[model samples]
Target chain A: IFKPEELRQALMPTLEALYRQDPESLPFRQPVDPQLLGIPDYFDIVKNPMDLSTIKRKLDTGQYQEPWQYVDDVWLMFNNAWLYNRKTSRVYKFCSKLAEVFEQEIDPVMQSL
Target chain B: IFKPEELRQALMPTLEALYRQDPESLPFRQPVDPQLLGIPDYFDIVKNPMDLSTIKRKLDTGQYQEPWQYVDDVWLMFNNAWLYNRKTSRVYKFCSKLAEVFEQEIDPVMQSL
Candidate 1:
């Protein structure tokens, strides 16, 4: 079983990579509020508006047998919000690239542990 | 100075034509509530969320000399909302067709008065 902290550590850099790719874009750009960025803080799961209890359940039951499976579950939760809202095509492209990064780097790192 | 009633009478059928053209589309489609439609009620100016005080002032000062000018002012007020929101391209096309109908039918009817 993976600790939440470990999952967070694996996830954050991929998010940061997304932000770095286009800091001025909608999801990455800072809003009018100083404290809030477009990106949700994955580390602070409690405050995330997305309901991730399903992912938590799967992880707890060890149903997410592969590292990439866990990554896909978390990524889907984040991507689904944008999909439902019909956010710009650029947002979709960003999610696609972020998924690639997770599969390439984060999944491998997690599996190594 | 033109009566608000007269302007509303001239404006509404063009809006109705829009609703008829694509009742299933985003802006024209009815909401979950039976009372609400995608189209705003132009007849009830006070209830309309759009601010048309500027259009009223233009009409009062005789700046809107042609019947079509008044039609343009009202249409702009409605169209601007969709424009600002970056609504779907279909909304723009629908507005374009609605403008044609106003110029062809409503303008002539109003000008004859």
Candidate 2:
């Protein structure tokens, strides 16, 4: 249904832009506090052991320990930590709109070309 | 960051498309089986009472009781139920890719015009 590499490639620039435009706007910013509201420092309390292991592996491998890694990690945490409150809903809505654009405007144009 | 009305408007068509193209492909379809795996019957166990009430209100008002209402309800359930496991992650990845397209290909062209 979804290709991880493709999504990663596609989102990298947008995530980068968001980070540059307003660092504070991002869910996860550099010099991560880990003490920030709703943010978890470790995978200790994650309900699913499988998910916890996956996240742990990512952290151990430095997959999400760097500055740039914050973007992907933010989304990852949004799901992993179940942070779909009102604030994060905005991001989900943005993605919903993006899906609309792809199907309504972009896909058709690309199909014709 | 997100406008609910705008999102609902934009998503309606694409969601309709997915429904028409392949009904089974959707996360939720008609004849909804409460007994289906990972599919809950009511909002009883939902973590947030606010969200549960919102969903219940929708159901009670027939806002999402109709056949056509499954699309929106499916997404709602996805977030509300915290169904971000491997299977549902595909949808999230799709959304992430969709956001990429908006920022990378679509937004730039729209801005130029």
Best by lDDT, which number? 1
TM-score to true structure, per model: 0.28, 0.21
lDDT of 1 by residue, A1-113 (tens): 55555554555554455444431122433211212222333334333332244555554555644456666665664565455333544445555655565467665566666
DockQ class, candidate 2: incorrect
Error of 2 at B44 (Å): 6.4
Considering only N, C-alpha and C atoms within 3 Å, which residue pairs clash in candidate 2?
A: none
**Any runs in candidate 1 off by more than 4 Å, and if so which?**
A24-73, A85-88, B1-113
Docking class of 1: incorrect
B1-113 in candidate 2: lDDT tens per residue?
33344434443444443333221222333332333322354345544222223433444444542333433454454444344334444434443433333234333323432
DockQ of each: 0.02, 0.01
For model 1 chain B, give the 10-residue run with minimal summed lDDT.
B25-34
**Per-model TM-score (chain A alone):** 0.42, 0.28
Please give, for residues A1-113, the per-residue lDDT of candidate 2 as tens digits.
Answer: 32433433343434333323221333333232336655574344444222222332343333543333433444454453343334466544543343333234333333332
How close to the true structure is residue B97 of candidate 2, measured as C-alpha lDDT? 38
Q: Worst 10-residue stretch by lDDT in candidate 2 chain A?
A: A48-57
